[PDB]
UniProtKB/Swiss-Prot annotation:
Source taxonomy: Bacteria, Thermotogati, Thermotogota, Thermotogae, Thermotogales
GO biological process assignments: translation
Name of the protein this chain belongs to: Small ribosomal subunit protein bS6
Similarity-based family: Belongs to the bacterial ribosomal protein bS6 family.
Record key words, sorted: Ribonucleoprotein, Ribosomal protein, RNA-binding, rRNA-binding
Domain of life: Bacteria
Naturally occurring in which organism (per UniProt): Thermotoga maritima (strain ATCC 43589 / DSM 3109 / JCM 10099 / NBRC 100826 / MSB8)
Shown stretch of the complete protein: 5 to 111 of 128
Keyword Nuclease: no
Amino acid sequence: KERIYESMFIIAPNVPEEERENLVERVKKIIEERVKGKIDKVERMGMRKFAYEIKKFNEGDYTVIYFRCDGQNLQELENFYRVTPEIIRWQTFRRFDLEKKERKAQR
């Protein structure tokens, strides 16, 4: 069956908010068209302060995207992040807990 992932990415706070929203849209399209993932949820968490600096910023605009795919093209997303300096931090995780939960819901 398909695997469930989260990807959280943080946009630098000196990027205008409309450009921030466009970056979000670009990430969605990378997941849809390149990862070949189905998006389940986009959580726009908005601006949040860090414990200590990241790339010399003290805050950044958080988004988490929950998606499912076959796990074979995840590098498409990683490679988008690698070339996009406006995204100052990201992390992508397979959500085994959510896969287990779904199997449980189904029975």
